[PDB]
């Protein structure tokens, strides 16, 4: 019964592979040497004069079994198509998560399997990493007692970084004044592993966290009480693994859960979940709003699917094969999807990375959303 599922996965991938010419305008597959747990497009695009492609870049990491890990910047050529590693920097343990600082995108924070959060300026490390394997971060951020995944830079206050940990805490650092920086503030409101944390995109004092205690918490840094958030919501019937604030609608956010649902929230009335998106057959680990389309979000996880949702289709008639608000199911991955990123310069392009080393850069067909 174990290796029967292997046949199920192989046959579905055979059908998916056959159907890509009608479902996608772009599919690029690349096998990394090691899997990445993390993916984020860097903000820059280059469009060289008189070439048929543009050049984009991604922050990736490694997850090895007992070998030297690296923080990785890759380049991707997208048509108007190769994938190449531009730099590898020595990293202590697997890269749980890596995120660039909006106000200086050379600066990358990483979550390690130890309690340290690391900060690298990637332009200050050699082109080839040293074979010794020594990790020399530009800052070590102290405060946590365990590893974690949540990591968020404040887009409205340069150098302010949030991190969530398996120690039940959220740490805040102000990195602006290989030294050790202790946390400016530690928020202790959760009673279980804190899975994710994110700054509000507009209000510099405001952030959200989600945890294995099944709660969504909304925090305000101006509050003197670090053990109690401003709002505390029973969000889901299992662990909550991710959150994302809508970039166009300042009161709207989304949470993804081990209960297999994505929840839609309005900050002004957190007693009433706005909607529950249902179609995932297993735990959801990432949710991300489209940078380009206010009603579009995506979700991924353990069921090996990346679902794209359109909130404007909630309530439409049918005749079903799925709810009306499910726009697209990406079935290109044959293992758990660990992370994904919407490309900020090419609408509808997604990069998604899975546990079997696969990185896919893809775009659903135009007729599906238009």
């Amino acid at each position: 019964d174990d290796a029967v599922e292997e046949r199920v996965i192989n046959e579905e991938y055979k059908i998916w592979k056959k159907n890509t010419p009608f479902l996608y305008d772009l599919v690029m597959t690349h096998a990394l040497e090691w899997p990445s747990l993390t993916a984020q497009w860097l903000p820059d695009v280059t469009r060289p004069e008189g070439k048929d492609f543009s050049i984009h870049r991604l922050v990736l990491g490694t997850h090895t079994s007992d070998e030297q890990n690296h923080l990785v910047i890759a380049s991707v050529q997208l048509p108007n198509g190769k994938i190449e590693i531009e730099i590898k920097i020595n990293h202590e343990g697997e890269v749980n998560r890596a995120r660039y600082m909006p106000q200086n995108p050379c600066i990358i924070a990483t979550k390690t399997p130890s309690s340290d959060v690391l900060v690298f300026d990637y332009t200050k490390h050699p082109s080839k990493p040293d074979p010794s394997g020594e990790c020399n971060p530009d800052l070590r951020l102290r405060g946590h007692q365990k590893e974690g995944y949540g990591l968020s830079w404040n887009p409205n206050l340069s150098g302010h970084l949030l991190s969530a940990s398996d120690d039940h805490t959220i740490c805040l650092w102000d990195i602006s004044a290989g030294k050790v920086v202790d946390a400016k503030t530690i928020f202790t409101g959760h009673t279980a592993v804190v899975e994710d944390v994110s700054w509000h995109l507009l209000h510099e004092s405001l952030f959200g966290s989600v945890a294995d205690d099944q709660k969504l918490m909304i925090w305000d840094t101006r509050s003197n009480n670090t053990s109690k958030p401003s709002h505390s919501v029973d969000a889901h019937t299992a662990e909550v693994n991710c959150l994302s604030f809508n970039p166009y609608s300042e009161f709207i956010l989304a949470t993804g859960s081990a209960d297999k649902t994505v929840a839609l929230w309005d900050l002004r009335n957190l007693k009433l979940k706005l909607h529950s998106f249902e179609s995932h057959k297993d735990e959801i680990f990432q949710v991300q709003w489209s940078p380009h389309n206010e009603t579009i979000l995506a979700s991924s996880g353990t069921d090996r699917r990346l679902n794209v949702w359109d909130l404007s289709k909630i309530g439409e008639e049918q005749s079903e094969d799925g709810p009306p608000e499910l726009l697209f199911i990406h079935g290109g991955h044959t293992a758990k999807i660990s992370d994904f990123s919407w490309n900020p310069n090419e609408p509808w392009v997604i990069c998604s990375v899975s546990e079997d080393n696969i990185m896919q850069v893809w775009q659903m067909a135009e007729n599906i959303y238009n």
Binding site: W34, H63, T64, S65, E67, E195
Partner: peptide, 10 residues
């Protein structure tokens, strides 16, 4: 609390 798989090399 997620459980990382054991990573295989290509």
């Amino acid at each position: 609390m997620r459980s990382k798989a054991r990573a295989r090399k290509l």
